Amino acid sequence: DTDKDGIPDNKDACPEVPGLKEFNGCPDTDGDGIPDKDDACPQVKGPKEFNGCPDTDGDGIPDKDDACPEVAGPKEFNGCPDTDGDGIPDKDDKCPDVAGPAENGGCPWPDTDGDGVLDKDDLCPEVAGPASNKGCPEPDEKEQKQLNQYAKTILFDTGKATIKFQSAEVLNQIINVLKKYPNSRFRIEGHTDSTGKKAKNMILSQNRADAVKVYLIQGGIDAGRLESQGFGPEKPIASNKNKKGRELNRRVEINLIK
Numbered sequence: 001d002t003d004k005d006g007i008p009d010n011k012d013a014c015p016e017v018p019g020l021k022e023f024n025g026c027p028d029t030d031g032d033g034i035p036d037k038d039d040a041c042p043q044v045k046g047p048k049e050f051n052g053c054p055d056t057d058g059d060g061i062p063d064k065d066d067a068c069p070e071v072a073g074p075k076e077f078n079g080c081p082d083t084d085g086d087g088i089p090d091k092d093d094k095c096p097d098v099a100g101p102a103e104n105g106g107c108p109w110p111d112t113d114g115d116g117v118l119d120k121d122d123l124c125p126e127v128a129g130p131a132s133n134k135g136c137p138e139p140d141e142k143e144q145k146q147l148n149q150y151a152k153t154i155l156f157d158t159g160k161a162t163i164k165f166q167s168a169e170v171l172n173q174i175i176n177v178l179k180k181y182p183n184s185r186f187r188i189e190g191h192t193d194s195t196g197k198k199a200k201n202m203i204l205s206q207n208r209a210d211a212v213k214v215y216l217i218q219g220g221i222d223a224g225r226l227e228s229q230g231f232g233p234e235k236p237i238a239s240n241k242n243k244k245g246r247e248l249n250r251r252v253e254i255n256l257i258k
């Protein structure tokens, strides 16, 4: 007995190390029943299933080989869980509990304003709008009428295209409405009645439309977003055979360009 463990030298698998009889004179350091020479975790108790290495979380992958030794996970990801099953392990999944594309981490593409147009596709991500306008709001039927109700109030000097001072208030109201729709374009329209010379009314209404466009530009609205057009008497909304009708036909409109 060279190492004095009780097991004869010839029948001592490890004759240099004092061990135990059960393992042919070889030591079992951690006492788990698997001798050191066969124990992949010789100082830590563990089942024979993993060669004396413990499987703490119980996913069938011993801690030594478990990339996430405390959380159960499939062998596909070396012991790391993919809870929502989007192929991205929780530890690298920005939204571990909701399946999502890899390019957005592991979260589904968000829709902040909830108009159904995803943030990455929503030209106006913070304001609800229809998808036909890339998620940007645009005036409905009743607001377009509202906008033209303001434009009706825009007054000019008789026979001239100079905007009267008193209508500066309604114009700024018009500006704020248009600022509410940054991505939309608008046609400024000048309309007269059929009284007098049509040729002169075409020029006048154009000059008046131009004037209103100029005012909106200085009020903040980008020039490229605006189109000015004189119609003369070419687009009546009322009869020209009576005074009240003609008064209705003399107007400025500010219409959404579709």
Ligand SMILES: [Ca+2]
Pocket: 001, 002, 003, 004, 005, 006, 007, 008, 009, 012, 015, 025
């Ligand atoms: Ca011995």
Ligand SMILES: [Ca+2]
Pocket: 003, 005, 007, 012, 013, 014, 015, 016, 017, 018, 019, 024, 025, 026
């Ligand atoms: Ca021995």
Ligand SMILES: [Ca+2]
Pocket: 028, 029, 030, 031, 032, 033, 034, 035, 036, 039, 042, 052
């Ligand atoms: Ca052991």
Ligand SMILES: [Ca+2]
Pocket: 030, 032, 034, 039, 040, 041, 042, 043, 044, 045, 046, 051, 052, 053
């Ligand atoms: Ca062990």
Ligand SMILES: [Ca+2]
Pocket: 055, 056, 057, 058, 059, 060, 061, 062, 063, 066, 069, 079
């Ligand atoms: Ca494990």
Ligand SMILES: [Ca+2]
Pocket: 057, 059, 061, 066, 067, 068, 069, 070, 071, 072, 073, 078, 079, 080
């Ligand atoms: Ca694990």
Ligand SMILES: [Ca+2]
Pocket: 082, 083, 084, 085, 086, 087, 088, 089, 090, 093, 096, 099, 106
């Ligand atoms: Ca996942």
Ligand SMILES: [Ca+2]
Pocket: 084, 086, 088, 093, 094, 095, 096, 097, 098, 099, 100, 106, 107
């Ligand atoms: Ca996810």
Ligand SMILES: [Ca+2]
Pocket: 111, 112, 113, 114, 115, 116, 117, 118, 119, 122, 124, 125, 135
């Ligand atoms: Ca949206």
Ligand SMILES: [Ca+2]
Pocket: 113, 115, 117, 122, 123, 124, 125, 126, 127, 128, 129, 134, 135, 136, 137
């Ligand atoms: Ca939007």
Ligand SMILES: [Ca+2]
Pocket: 229
């Ligand atoms: Ca035009």
